[PDB]
Symmetry: D2
Amino acid sequence: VERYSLSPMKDLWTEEAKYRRWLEVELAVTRAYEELGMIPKGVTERIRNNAKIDVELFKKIEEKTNHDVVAFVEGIGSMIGEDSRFFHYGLTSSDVLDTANSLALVEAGKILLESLKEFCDVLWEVANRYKHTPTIGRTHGVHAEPTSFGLKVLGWYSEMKRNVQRLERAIEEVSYGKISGAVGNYANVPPEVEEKALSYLGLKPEPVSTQVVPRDRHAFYLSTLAIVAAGIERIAVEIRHLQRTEVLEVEEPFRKSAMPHKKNPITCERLTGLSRMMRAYVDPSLENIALWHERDISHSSVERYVFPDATQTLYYMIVTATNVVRNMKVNEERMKKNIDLTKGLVFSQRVLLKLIEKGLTRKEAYDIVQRNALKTWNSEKHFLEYLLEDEEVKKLVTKEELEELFDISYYLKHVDHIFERFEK
Amino acid sequence: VERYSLSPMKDLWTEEAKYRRWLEVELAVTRAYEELGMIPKGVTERIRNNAKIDVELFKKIEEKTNHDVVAFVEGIGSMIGEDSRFFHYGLTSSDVLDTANSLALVEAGKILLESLKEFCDVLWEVANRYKHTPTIGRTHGVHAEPTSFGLKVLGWYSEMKRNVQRLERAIEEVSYGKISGAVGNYANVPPEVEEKALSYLGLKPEPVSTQVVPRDRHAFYLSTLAIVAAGIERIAVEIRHLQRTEVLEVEEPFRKSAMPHKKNPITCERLTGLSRMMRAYVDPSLENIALWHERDISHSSVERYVFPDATQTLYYMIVTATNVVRNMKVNEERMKKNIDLTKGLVFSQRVLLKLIEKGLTRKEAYDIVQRNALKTWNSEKHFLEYLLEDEEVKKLVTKEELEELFDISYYLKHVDHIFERFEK
Amino acid sequence: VERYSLSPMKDLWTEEAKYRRWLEVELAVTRAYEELGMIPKGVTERIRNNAKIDVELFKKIEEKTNHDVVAFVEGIGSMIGEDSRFFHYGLTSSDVLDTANSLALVEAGKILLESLKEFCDVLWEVANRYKHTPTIGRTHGVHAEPTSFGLKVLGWYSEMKRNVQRLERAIEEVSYGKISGAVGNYANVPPEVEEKALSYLGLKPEPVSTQVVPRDRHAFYLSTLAIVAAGIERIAVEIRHLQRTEVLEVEEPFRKSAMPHKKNPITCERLTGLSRMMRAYVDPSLENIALWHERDISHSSVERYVFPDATQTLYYMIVTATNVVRNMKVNEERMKKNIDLTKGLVFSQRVLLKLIEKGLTRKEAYDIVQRNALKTWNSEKHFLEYLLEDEEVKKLVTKEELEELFDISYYLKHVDHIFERFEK
Amino acid sequence: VERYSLSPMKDLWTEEAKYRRWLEVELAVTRAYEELGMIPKGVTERIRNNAKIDVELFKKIEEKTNHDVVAFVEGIGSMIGEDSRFFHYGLTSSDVLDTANSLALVEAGKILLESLKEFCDVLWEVANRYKHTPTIGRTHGVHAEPTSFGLKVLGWYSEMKRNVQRLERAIEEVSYGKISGAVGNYANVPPEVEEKALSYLGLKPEPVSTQVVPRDRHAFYLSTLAIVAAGIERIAVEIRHLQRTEVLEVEEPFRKSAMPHKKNPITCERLTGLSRMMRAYVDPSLENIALWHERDISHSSVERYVFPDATQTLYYMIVTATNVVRNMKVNEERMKKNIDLTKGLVFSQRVLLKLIEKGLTRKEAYDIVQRNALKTWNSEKHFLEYLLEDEEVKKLVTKEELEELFDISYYLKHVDHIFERFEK
């Protein structure tokens, strides 16, 4: 979907880029044959000088051929004269197709990784900026206990740092190509040429290939991408809840005057939808693993959708989420005020416990708290004021003692130690 | 589904086992508080002596409570007298639930890993046993070039060895628990107690938790399990094709006389179906990542299906596939004979190339080969015999030269080097 | 997951129930052969008298057999004397297995359909109860324009009425059985027997079967169930939002005093999670369609999870959602008050339009409205009051004219027309 | 993926086509207001004359707007003079967007439905062509009992006829539009306008809409499409098996001489892969149902992939499968010869039964049949010949009686009855 495509990534997935990768692979193989003394000196440099990418010519030949790599080999053959004898020498089409897709998934992976590290840098900056900003923790959508907004963002940071390590592992998993010929056993092209040719490309040889590179590698890479997307979805759902009219704690960046009451979290709603497409790609990638014998080509039509679409969608997601967190407005005063929306009832467990500590049993303290909690809920007077006027409370706790149970500081006392876990 | 449950694994997922894990977690926390001097000496040893698992009592209390951990804490409270003051001290229910599920997924992971390493040992033994057994490589279900059956099995070995490393990484990802209280910020239980208590359990502290352990860890573990399952599905589909009546190259082990013509690959068809359920669990696990704020409990009902079912299904798959490969009959003579099903036409590319090497151009050689190939296909006479009687061939190649193009040895010459990549 | 299992539905999926369905199919077949004069008069009644379900016996035989239907046939054979010659005569195992699963899915469908009609009845009652209750319509989680809460609930009613029709069609789709023998062509059991036997069971003959009933029927049924579930998820997500502390418009029923500030929408979170499982079953059901030739048994292991689990889960969801909507508290006064949370800005488009109607151009009216909207947003004074004090407004519109733009009755004027579409 | 796009279907999903549908919806609305006397006579005709689709202009405005429908409305407004007062009057953006997607999915549905009926016609022709052609029925990939190839193809016909009915129902489900304004309650555009406008477009009014048309309709449509696709996958997997070198019963059409031994079922492998994508779109479509309140826009990004891609992919699958089945080669002599691959053992159950009929018990007959089956399996001599030479057989059955058990006509006797169920 062109509206989500962004440079560097979208340049990777053009037809010109694909043919440039197929020629890269073929020239690494001729270079390796030549370096081993198997083809005459000078061949690689002459093919490098004569072989040009002409998409229109390859596509025209493919109309006759109906086989894309064969048409490319014939098209290049037409430019390189007698050196065609040593071009594509012993290879099967998937030696070029799969090695070029490893090049592409490695490159897309590095683009993704750089953008994810930038996202982590933005999340660290924002978590530290609001490290001591109080906000109400919410469980089941219901106010629970105070916490820090910085710590909420640090949770996102921690997840994206896990996803950096996962994406480095997925890049390693797809760093394998194959130059092993028709059914993967080097009958027609030597394993010495594979090892040398793939090392020139920055790739490793599949230790055993068939006609193709085994598709559990690609399924691992795309499952990884979907987990990164789902972490971004988690952040986007949070911002959507926090921008709702009854909450008003954050506002995603927008246009660039606008109506104050109509600021909608559209970017984060879009990111949530794109996470659904990233996880939709996992199942067909897993179904591609069980190819018949030394291969069938059912995976090729799936991968024409999934390789360019999963990588471009996730790149859009990361860059977009980065700008959201970097530039979102954070309404600190409103966060603080929202702790007091229930008029002190967030501190009810501390009051209950103090009433037990001062002698009473769970059920007696419970009934005092519940009675004052119901009066608070149904009126304008705050919980502390009801408790201060309660005679049973007045006999058990001093006013200073009671008031210190309403301190937000109780809840934020260990925030530093949690941040210190990341200054590793 | 009880018919696929197998000891050790099925013992992990009983109600008794779950309550034993919840008590394990609670006693690690009291031990840590006591070791830090926060609760009186002697408490842990007295709760360890008095706290017993009584499933019927906890379940009865839960009918009143409607909250499973609270009923367990109340039930244990009823056995431990005054030491109940220091039991579950400052914890939220998910500190026990999620830490106990980390214990369970770690243990299930180790059971899985041991069985997968055993599977790799069986695949190595079988790949080496048939290292030099010739068989026809097949692409698109169509005979391609000769290869070795051992090398086909080594391909399965290579995949299961990748899955050993992946499953070690997934065990590490789920080795994190949390003892951080209501919204994950240690307001009510110190981070020193979490770190000590989790180290007694063999777990690490989530560096930042909310009320729960972040669910991208569980999605990573279950995506890993589905990729292992899909690798087993790949082996099972291969055995199903190879047992078909027209192929008869392998036969999965059976009953224990049976009718020779009615041996069906039922075990491998069952394994293919169970792979569909393992990949079905990935999507709902990915959808569980985006919990609202500091948690909602939507994931808990999914995980009641997925945690016990994914781990028990994959364990059944691994153990079962191990017995299949260990005991399957491998019909070496039939594999060899099947190379000659097309009467020599597997060697047609070598014949074509030789005719070009001896002067002719691609299209002339092609037409000689195609004409003799069509006569072969439509008759009982073999390709070599047609070629020996062809006058154009007779002028270009000696009979010895022609006959050596029909050598299977050409295709198997690099098998050792591929096996040597695994003697690392 | 036993915890979500509920009578009648759970009674359908026991081992006893399965063998009772297998016996029902066999007795329908003997009845049909007998009515066609192909077996002696009296056989069916005798087998009916003698054939008892003994689960322990069938299981013990199946340990020897390893084939469930064969063990059942042998076990019944041991009870029926010389009538065993006429029992299971000409049948293949899937004639019994697939016809009995059609019985099961038809009966589960009818249980589901009656519960869903009851859910519709509850939704109609609740939508009419709050037919004219004002509430704020919300788009992107942001207040948009007033509407009625009864209209919101009528949208749920409308969806569940579509799901009643869809479930009726899904029942029809699975109302097909097969009594056609080994490869579905009546070589061993006559088509007149199938037609008669299935008519006694309330089923139609698959017009052409293989060894099995084609699995697109089961995938259509399960796809249908997942859509019903997602409709319940939509309702559950709405109640979760409306129960949040900042909104407080509805509260799901609970326990049965409780703390007023800690009412969590746990049932609706559980329903959201169960909908993820219902949609997870669709993929494996679609993968089961492409069986090899006249069948493979890969689907059987999947359907052992999916058939009982999809039907029991959805029945739990429907019954549970019905009780939620039936007994939820609806806070009408809070709904009305939340319309004024933005202090009149929900009527800003009417003000804008009136200013244009009284001469001004879009941009001039926008600037007046935006200026007064910003003042409102950042203060305590209401929008109407800023407009009444604005000199440009005062020259264009009377106070009566301005004030009638703040009327909720403008937004509810076509509620009755919408409800009439669903009447008699 | 442009490579699978085919006219008419691809013409539906261009930007030009989208804006032409948006204009059609707007003109239906102006026509309805005009026919109800709410806007002046002649407006609709003038707007129709003046409103031109200028994709470059709308895109340029949308760079400023960032809202696609608003930019279209502004662009048209610049062409229609004072009639802009009456254009888009009272509408919300999704009144246009969702009604236009209903137009699109209805038209794509009708394109699909006509191609699927044509596919049924081809399947009926081919099933009748081979109505009595003998072939071996295969269960678990193992030869079972003879049947007819026409019956196999009639099973595909039967499935595609079920899919015709399902696609008709899916078209009806998406035949709903909405012209109900911001939160779906007609505050700003009257219900009589919606009813009239949608009737001009061939659509019905959603009986209760929110800001959007409810997304269970789209999920039902896409679920339906995925089931059609899996039926095509079933056919493609069958042709792949039958084209394998060991079977050689069918060959898909190809290029247009080719090598006889290297005909690969590449089209059917591609169809298998495209069915994986069709089922991958179901999950995200089901996840789009649970939109927040009166809508969020998370579905819009998903539907930008799924609507054009699901409909174009399935149309490519149907047209392509139709040409495969129309032009595939069917090797009748090979089908007949493959029945005798096991040298008569396909009739072993008839022999077993005859031996029991002539007195013997199940176990005695089993042992005679198994002994002669094993001899057959391990030699060149046929089963009938071993039975004719067996002394226990010779005492129980005449040669004529034995020989008539090897008659294929026993297995095909009810083919005509099955085809009659589908006649006139």
